[PDB]
Design a binder for these strands. Structure first.
Lengths: 207, 324
RNA sequence: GACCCUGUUGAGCUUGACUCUAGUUUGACAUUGUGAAAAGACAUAGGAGGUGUAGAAUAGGUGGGAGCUUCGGCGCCAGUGAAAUACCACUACUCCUAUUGUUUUUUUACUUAUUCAAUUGAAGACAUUGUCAGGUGGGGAGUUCCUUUAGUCCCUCGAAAUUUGAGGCUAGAGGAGAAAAGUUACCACA
């Protein structure tokens, strides 16, 4: 890729596209990746995570599956923490737990609770692409959720087109093009080959 | 609700939880209930008339003369004769021992009339375990050509050889071959026929083990085996012939992995296959899309047969043409 | 009498070796062309779709995205669904049309091939022919590994929205030669 071309399109995004459209949605863009001749029905399917320390989406609907020594910190931080009786209630009714799975965009689970999750609601929630990230022994809920979030899951599916939405207009241009450069470098590294393997890169906005 | 319907259906009919869920999906709710009545219910008994030694009317007169209550079945068949009551056992009649008529089912009839076998034509059958299909095909070529009977089990072959030589076929060779290996052996036929090993949901009256003894693992390997079975059918037929030769795909299952998915895989992998109107008088068109996946619209020409509409076993029929 | 045995005869059952090959057979490629008529396939350029179920519904699909917004219709939401409709952004199959072509067949003839009489006429692009890649081979010439089970879930080929199937590899146990041989709580005879 050319860094001059990246500057051309992010200048064309902000603020030429802002002047053309005057977007009334949440101002964000997405990157769409097309590739020529990689058969999705074959082997070496790829599924990786991209560590992005920028948090492109601030409105990040977050909840935790917390054990003890997390109730007071989550209540102070405005984080919904549910005890073991609540997951039992959320296991009794399966329609309600699916609805809030659509509502809440990420699940954070502890070590012991992820061992208790595959009883009956494990495979039931596993059929959504809703893998919960496990916590570490540091037990510092501050800035670990920020590091756990904004981790883009580059997952291969059976369709020959793939899109990821990152980057807002409220942040500086130098940081977002660093996010774009880090994303396409991890995408190339996760692929079976280098930059030849991709065919087209569209970094246009949603609107 | 749907979940209460699945638990009640599995309890009262004794199905497995999986296969009831799959069969409930392909039907509207009241249509599913009428289907569950019929497939458990035993099917009518049907007779194929040997055209070689007798014909429809004089065999019919002969069996009533022995006390057998018959009725010509449908306008579909000039060859079929339904039975209703019989003082003498059906296999006991001297017409049977000469080979004037053979016990069959209705679903054994329709692949053969889906094919259009002509005289002096080289034909085939990858699975001829009861041998009714093979004897029907030879009835149409009037003792000419050559049929390659094939079945991978020697135990079924003894009933094949007994049924063939009673019926007076004189033109069939029977080989105990895996039919995946068969185009390497010969290839170059006119009209090949395949009745694949299938899940058997189309007929539960004859085989009631499929009520429960059919699970997730069996629904992956079994349609997998039809694919290698079916790709061999194109790779064995002739792209051109003096009389044009066609493949026929016949399965005894109503499942959607076994039927309308294998033909999608075949017509994608081999572009030298077309599918046209299959020549059977009635039927229901195949589904162009079932679970988010699209098949090519040639499957509207395929015919599906159901226990609830017709007193027949569950069936799929599709005929292929070879190009190159 | 039952019952046991011996010999002959039936019913079997298990064998009856390996490598090239006669024979025989499948596919592919050539002599084997020249026209017409059609048909089909792909090469591009246009036009239009779509009702398994449920969902109010003729839901391709996919990226996002929650009023983009002319009426606040459509929205949002709610359902219903594997997938949900607003909004923009992408590209698939099918059926037609066109010419912006490459072709492949079938039919109809002719002989420009090919085969007989002859030693110029008919058949006629049919055969026929040869070469590769195979199947079989109780025949001809010489010659003296598979079976049962598990694992590497390692490698290869398949299949599947992520797990399978088939081959490879490894390790626990077995081994005078198409003229005829061993066996049965079996049959008929002596």
């Amino acid at each position: 890729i050319t860094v001059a071309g990246v500057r051309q399109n992010v200048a064309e995004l902000l603020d030429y596209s802002n002047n053309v459209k005057k977007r009334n949605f949440l101002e964000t863009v997405e990157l769409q990746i097309g590739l020529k001749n990689y058969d999705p029905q074959r082997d070496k399917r790829f599924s990786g995570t991209v560590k992005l320390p920028t948090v492109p989406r601030p409105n990040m609907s977050i909840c935790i599956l917390g054990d003890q020594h997390d109730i007071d910190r989550a209540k102070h931080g405005g984080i919904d923490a549910m005890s073991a009786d609540d997951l039992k209630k959320l296991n009794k009714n399966k329609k309600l737990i699916k609805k809030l799975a659509r509502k809440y965009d990420a699940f954070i689970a502890s070590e012991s609770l992820i061992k208790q999750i595959p009883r009956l609601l494990g495979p039931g929630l596993s059929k959504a692409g809703k893998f919960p990230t496990p916590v570490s022994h540091s037990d510092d809920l501050s800035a670990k959720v920020n590091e756990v979030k904004s981790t883009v899951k580059f997952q291969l599916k059976k369709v020959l087109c793939m899109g990821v939405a990152v980057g807002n207009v409220g942040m500086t241009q130098e940081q977002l093009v660093a996010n774009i450069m880090l994303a396409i470098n991890y995408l190339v590294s996760l692929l079976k080959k280098g930059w030849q393997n991709v065919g087209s890169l569209t970094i246009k906005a949603t609107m | 609700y749907t979940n209460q319907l699945l638990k009640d259906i599995c309890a009262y009919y004794g199905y497995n939880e999986y296969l009831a869920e799959k069969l409930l999906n392909l039907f509207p709710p009241r249509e599913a209930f009428a289907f569950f009545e019929a497939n458990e219910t035993p099917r009518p008994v049907v007779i194929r008339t040997n055209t070689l030694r007798t014909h429809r009317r004089d065999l019919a007169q002969a069996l009533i003369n022995r006390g057998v209550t018959l009725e010509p079945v449908g306008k579909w068949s000039k060859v079929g004769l339904q039975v209703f009551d019989s003082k003498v056992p059906l296999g006991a009649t001297p017409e049977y021992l000469a080979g004037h008529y053979i016990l069959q089912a209705a679903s054994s009839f329709l692949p053969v009339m889906a094919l259009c076998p002509q005289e002096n034509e080289r034909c085939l059958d990858m699975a001829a375990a009861p041998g009714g299909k093979t004897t029907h095909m030879a009835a149409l070529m009037k003792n000419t050509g050559v049929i390659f009977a094939n079945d991978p089990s020697k135990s079924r072959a003894k009933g094949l050889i007994g049924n063939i030589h009673r019926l007076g076929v004189r033109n069939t060779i029977v080989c105990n071959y895996d039919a995946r290996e068969f185009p390497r052996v010969i290839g170059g036929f006119d009209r090949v026929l395949l009745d694949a090993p299938c899940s058997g949901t189309g007929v539960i009256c004859k085989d009631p083990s499929v009520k429960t003894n059919r699970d997730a693992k069996d629904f992956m390997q079994l349609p997998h085996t039809q694919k290698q079975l079916l790709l061999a059918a194109i790779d064995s037929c002739n792209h051109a012939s003096k009389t044009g030769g066609y493949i026929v795909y016949s399965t005894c299952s109503v499942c959607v992995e076994e039927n309308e998915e294998v033909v999608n895989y075949a017509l994608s992998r081999r572009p030298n296959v077309k599918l046209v109107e299959t020549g059977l008088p009635f039927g229901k068109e195949g589904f162009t899309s079932y679970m988010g996946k699209t098949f090519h619209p040639s499957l509207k020409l395929t015919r599906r047969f159901y226990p609830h509409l017709y007193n027949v076993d569950g069936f799929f029929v599709a005929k292929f043409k070879k190009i190159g």
